[PDB]
Each structure stands twice: as structure tokens, then as C-alpha cells.
Amino acid sequence: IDVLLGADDGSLAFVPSEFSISPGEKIVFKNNAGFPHNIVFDEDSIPSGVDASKISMSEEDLLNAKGETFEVALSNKGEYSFYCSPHQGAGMVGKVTVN
């Protein structure tokens, strides 16, 4: 699944922001508008036992040019909440369910 970082009207949103995937499916997060952006999984809001660091950018890491990507595959089933650290309070958050 492809996810835009920033909407095409400049909105600080993941597009889509809520979605479901299967195990091992890749998510390609693509810098689109309003960057810098990153993608950080919430360590307290992912499936027990998952290492947030294996699936996240650090908070200090950034994608800061248009078209740059962050790719991640998820395997463990369950709900994963994530956010863009510099834009979180603006509402740039999401949740992916692996089912």
C-alpha cells in the first residue's frame, strides 16, 4: 500500500491514514507535501512484543524532500498507531491494522 505524507492540498495528513494490510505487506510512505515528515510507530500502541525501532524512523530522522520514501513491512497481527513527529499535534497521525 502507498501512503502520501501530506495531502495534495498541503494538509498535514497521511493519505490514507487508517488502513488494513496483510502480514508481510509493504507500506511505502512517500513525501508529498508539507515536509519535512517522518513516520514513528507508537511503542505503547503497537502489537506486544513488536520492536518499534525495526518498523519506525527515529523521531530525529526526517524525509525532507519531495518523493523520498520510507518503506516498512509489518508481520505481527494487530493494530499499529503511528505519527509524524513534527506534525503530530496538527493531527498527522494514523493507524494500520495487520489482519
What x-and-dash track marks residues 23-62 binding Cu ion by CB under 5 A? --------------x-------------------------
Q: What's the alpha-carbon Rg for the chain, to the nearest Å? A: 12
Q: How do 69-73 and 26-31 pair as beta strands?
A: antiparallel
Does the annotation list 84 as a binding residue? yes
91 noted as active-site residue: no
Which range, of 39-47, 57-65, 68-76, 83-91, touches Cu ion by CB under 5 A? 83-91
Q: Is 92 in the site for Cu ion (CB under 5 A)?
A: yes
11 noted as active-site residue: no
Distance CA 32, CA 26 (A): 18
* Burial class for 51, CB neighbours closer than 10 Å (0-12, 13-18, 19+): exposed
Does the annotation list 17 as a binding residue? no
Which residues are documented as binding site for Cu cation? 37, 84, 87, 92
